[PDB]
Amino acid sequence: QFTERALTILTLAQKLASDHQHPQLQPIHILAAFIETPEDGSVPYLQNLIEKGRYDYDLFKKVVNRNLVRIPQQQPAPAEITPSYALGKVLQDAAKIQKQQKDSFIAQDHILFALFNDSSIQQIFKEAQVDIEAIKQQALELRGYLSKYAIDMTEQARQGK
Amino acid sequence: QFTERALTILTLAQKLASDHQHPQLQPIHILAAFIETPEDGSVPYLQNLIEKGRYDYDLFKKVVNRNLVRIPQQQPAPAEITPSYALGKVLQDAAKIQKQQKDSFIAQDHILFALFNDSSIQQIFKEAQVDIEAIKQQALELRGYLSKYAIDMTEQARQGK
Amino acid sequence: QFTERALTILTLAQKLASDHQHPQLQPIHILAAFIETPEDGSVPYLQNLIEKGRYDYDLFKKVVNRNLVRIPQQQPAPAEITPSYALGKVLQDAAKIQKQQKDSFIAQDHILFALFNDSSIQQIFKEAQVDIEAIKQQALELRGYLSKYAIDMTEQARQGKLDPVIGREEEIRSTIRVLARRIKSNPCLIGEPGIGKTAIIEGVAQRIIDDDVPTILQGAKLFSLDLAALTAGAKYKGDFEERFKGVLKEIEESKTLIVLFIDEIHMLMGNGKDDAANILKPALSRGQLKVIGATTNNEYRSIVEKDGAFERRFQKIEVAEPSVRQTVAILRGLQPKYEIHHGVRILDSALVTAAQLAKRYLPYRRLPDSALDLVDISCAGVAVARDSQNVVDSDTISETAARLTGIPVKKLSESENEKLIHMERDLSSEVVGQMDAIKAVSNAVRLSRSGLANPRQPASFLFLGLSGSGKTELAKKVAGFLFNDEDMMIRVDCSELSEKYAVSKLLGTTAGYVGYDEGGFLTNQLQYKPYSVLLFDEVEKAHPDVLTVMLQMLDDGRITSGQGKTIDCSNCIVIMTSNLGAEFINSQQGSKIQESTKNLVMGAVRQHFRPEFLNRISSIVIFNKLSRKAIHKIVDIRLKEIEERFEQNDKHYKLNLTQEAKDFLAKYGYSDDMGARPLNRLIQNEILNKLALRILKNEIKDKETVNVVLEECLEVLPNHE
Numbered sequence A, B: 001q002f003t004e005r006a007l008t009i010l011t012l013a014q015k016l017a018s019d020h021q022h023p024q025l026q027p028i029h030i031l032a033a034f035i036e037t038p039e040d041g042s043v044p045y046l047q048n049l050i051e052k053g054r055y056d057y058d059l060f061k062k063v064v065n066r067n068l069v070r071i072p073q074q075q076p077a078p079a080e081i082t083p084s085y086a087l088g089k090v091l092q093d094a095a096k097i098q099k100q101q102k103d104s105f106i107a108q109d110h111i112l113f114a115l116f117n118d119s120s121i122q123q124i125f126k127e128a129q130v131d132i133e134a135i136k137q138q139a140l141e142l143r144g145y146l147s148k149y150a151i152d153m154t155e156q157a158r159q160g161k
Numbered sequence C: 001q002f003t004e005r006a007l008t009i010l011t012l013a014q015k016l017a018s019d020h021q022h023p024q025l026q027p028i029h030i031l032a033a034f035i036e037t038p039e040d041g042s043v044p045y046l047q048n049l050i051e052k053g054r055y056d057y058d059l060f061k062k063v064v065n066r067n068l069v070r071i072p073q074q075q076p077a078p079a080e081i082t083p084s085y086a087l088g089k090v091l092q093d094a095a096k097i098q099k100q101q102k103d104s105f106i107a108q109d110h111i112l113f114a115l116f117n118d119s120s121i122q123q124i125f126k127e128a129q130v131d132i133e134a135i136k137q138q139a140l141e142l143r144g145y146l147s148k149y150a151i152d153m154t155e156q157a158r159q160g161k162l163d164p165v166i167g168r169e170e171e172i173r174s175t176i177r178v179l180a181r182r183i184k185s186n187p188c189l190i191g192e193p194g195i196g197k198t199a200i201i202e203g204v205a206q207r208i209i210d211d212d213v214p215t216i217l218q219g220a221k222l223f224s225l226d227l228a229a230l231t232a233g234a235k236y237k238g239d240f241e242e243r244f245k246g247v248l249k250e251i252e253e254s255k256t257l258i259v260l261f262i263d264e265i266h267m268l269m270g271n272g273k274d275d276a277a278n279i280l281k282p283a284l285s286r287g288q289l290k291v292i293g294a295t296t297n298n299e300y301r302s303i304v305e306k307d308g309a310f311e312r313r314f315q316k317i318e319v320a321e322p323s324v325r326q327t328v329a330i331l332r333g334l335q336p337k338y339e340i341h342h343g344v345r346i347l348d349s350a351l352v353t354a355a356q357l358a359k360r361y362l363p364y365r366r367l368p369d370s371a372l373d374l375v376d377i378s379c380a381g382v383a384v385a386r387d388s389q390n391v392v393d394s395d396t397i398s399e400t401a402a403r404l405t406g407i408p409v410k411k412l413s414e415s416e417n418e419k420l421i422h423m424e425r426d427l428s429s430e431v432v433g434q435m436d437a438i439k440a441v442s443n444a445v446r447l448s449r450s451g452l453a454n455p456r457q458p459a460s461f462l463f464l465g466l467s468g469s470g471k472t473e474l475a476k477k478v479a480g481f482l483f484n485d486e487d488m489m490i491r492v493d494c495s496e497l498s499e500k501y502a503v504s505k506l507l508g509t510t511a512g513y514v515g516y517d518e519g520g521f522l523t524n525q526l527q528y529k530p531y532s533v534l535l536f537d538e539v540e541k542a543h544p545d546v547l548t549v550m551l552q553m554l555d556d557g558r559i560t561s562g563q564g565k566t567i568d569c570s571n572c573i574v575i576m577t578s579n580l581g582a583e584f585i586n587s588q589q590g591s592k593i594q595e596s597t598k599n600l601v602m603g604a605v606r607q608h609f610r611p612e613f614l615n616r617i618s619s620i621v622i623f624n625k626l627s628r629k630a631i632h633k634i635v636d637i638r639l640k641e642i643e644e645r646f647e648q649n650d651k652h653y654k655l656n657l658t659q660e661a662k663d664f665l666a667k668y669g670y671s672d673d674m675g676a677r678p679l680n681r682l683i684q685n686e687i688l689n690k691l692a693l694r695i696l697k698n699e700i701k702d703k704e705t706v707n708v709v710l711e712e713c714l715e716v717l718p719n720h721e
């Protein structure tokens, strides 16, 4: 199954479908799940594959928002019907990745990868997260962050203070 | 009657009617009052119910600014003039909300709901405030920390007691 | 590149082709390797990726046997011509699989996979899909297991991560004797932290690495168990058993002599027991499940008290610290590691002295580590300083230790000068006469500095004489010169006594009773400050129970505490005082200390002060009477210091005291029966009182004079403006 890091993202994605009162969860809600809040350790958004891949993650968030506002309905009672076949495929793909990696659980790293395989921006010069090969180049730096638990005294010193 | 926050906003709204030399205070000025300035601490604008809901705070602002331009600018004698019947209604509705919410002073938040209900930015490039579900959820999620753990002695002092 | 298992399967493919007289090697021959043996344990044949996956192993068995029969019999010379591109590709794909799987060696499963991925039944007689996912599932559930539970010390040792240890051969053999038991498979190392318990476990690993192990254990491997998988790896209530029980069962059989070990076995008692991993283990103790633990003696005590069960399985193995010489032997074994670690040379004498240094100055640390710290610290010291060298024995070590442990005593001076050559002068400059007290101070320190003073005893002197003669002042001035800081002195009012004093003195409160602040004044301060000057304010009036206790510091410097530990003083100078001699000082028979008279005093002191104390004390010191000649120096000394201590020089004096003022003091504040103390009364009663008034009246703007009246008076700068 999924571990807590992946479940957080997945939970957020479903929550976002309900935050937008939409009947189904779409790839866009997951991309929105990737970019929730400005918490650095979030590989899906800030200390990410995107910056390392030389992309602007806030610009990407603008892309995501531009797509979120295009959701055809926000009707209350119709909301929360399904996770969608579209994401059935993605989550199934995540399982395929687990097999490829011999991994007993799906991490945010895997769920990112799986969506990325099925993600898109309908843009030629996509401002999207860097394509899959780079995703692997940087995702593979993970497993095989401290700022969540500590203050970087050295950095504060670099900044005076 | 009004909270310090509501008073700040209404002071600003009335101020804006005189700053832009408008014939009357309108819902637009209150929206503009909420957009005091893009301060990081700007609860009704940068951290608001729309940005965390459906639409970009920067674009919302630009619409409001266009509306401030569209409302005619006049000489100091015709400038400002009145709070307007429009807001007599919005603010009284905000008062109704206070009763619904069991709160003795008018919250700027209640003004946001009453205000938003009257307004409607129906651009194809909609900036119309995300409707009530997103607005209310985000409103309910405002702060919700220190007061669960403390007595605000300084407000108490303002309220006597 | 390959595991032994992978090499076996490939090798069998090749040799089976030779045995079956077959030309070029085909996928068929690797499949032949897969079905080479009836053993079910052979994953390639019965407990298969096929059989437990999707298809009947017999389907595959017959594919291969049919094909082996089908391939015609060749001359033995070509029977195995080449792997060609066919097996080349399978082996290369097995390597691609390693890359995908992040596996450091080719597994027999990678060969099973790669072959299966390429292969297809060549004939209509049998059909089966290459069910890649089924074969991966079954491969993943087998063999790979300890990387999820415990750290493989033995292989890491094969990889050079082991630190070889020496001098513990019996202790290592003891673990072997216990591990060699048939029923009671569980040893535990018990001792002081820093004693070498982990080191012994690694010693066992060394024994394993060199294959110096009895058959029962000959194939053994060591794995570090606990805290991670046993605690961090837990979210659910059954997680104390999930993974844990799993690994216990995974290691019971076949996979060589797996021995797990616990470095921090203290946890395994359970917080209130409740089988927090702790009971399941011993519950299964009737067989296999060989584990060696490690705990300190007090942790042992605690896990015993908090459990009562693991102890029936675990053998208590006592670990003693090595002697200094033995410690040096390990230091020598470790020396090149340190030279390499830091890039510095180390002298054998560095090691020798480090060990004896530690025994002398590091009572709270065990020799193995203490000596090593002196070495590794010194080396690190140099490594940092290396921007400039090598480690030089006592030179580097004495300095290094003093910097961290305190005790500058061992550094030796850049010039001994004021540092105990001219010290008698310097002491006589601060205080007047009483040269023997001065000599005692210097000698105390000189013997300490030279490493000559009997190491078991702090310098200790009792100072007899009339109060006001400078007995406290001396002690304070000693601290002055000792630390270049007169406030570093420790001073206790030893006269504040009755029997109800435990904790106020070094004895401390006793654990088990209210209050856990113990001997703060002495015990805590002594623990913190390795040396000082300890002044006892009139031992003459101290209760004898305390004096008897103080004796223990006085000599045989060991010090106990109610905490259950000791302090053990060494380098603190102790100073005891008494005025008994005042009964003889007041004879006024010369400024010098008289023979017989001084003996009557010391005799009487023994009568009124346990001689047992005085039979250990370095010496009794007697003060000179402060004759006017002494006063003629003292007054200047005191007026100077007194002035210097007056805040800031916004005023102060020009001090035209001359002999006239000096004599007035020598004729008016000079009480023969109260030392120089009454001169200070005179000075404040006259000089400061008038001064304060002139200051108060704002009659002084800056500086001031002393003008003899015939008494003394001061001048007016502004006229009461």
Ligand SMILES: Nc1ncnc2c1ncn2[C@@H]1O[C@H](COP(=O)(O)OP(=O)(O)OP(O)(O)=S)[C@@H](O)[C@H]1O
Pocket: C163, C164, C165, C166, C167, C168, C192, C193, C194, C195, C196, C197, C198, C199, C200, C263, C294, C295, C296, C330, C334, C368, C369, C372
């Ligand atoms: N007999 C020995 N052979 C080799 N190294 C040793 C030996 N004794 C001590 N050491 C050193 O001591 C250090 C580790 O000391 P250990 O005695 O295992 O620590 P420990 O005392 O096991 O830790 P505790 O008390 O169980 S937390 C290593 O850095 C070794 O170099």
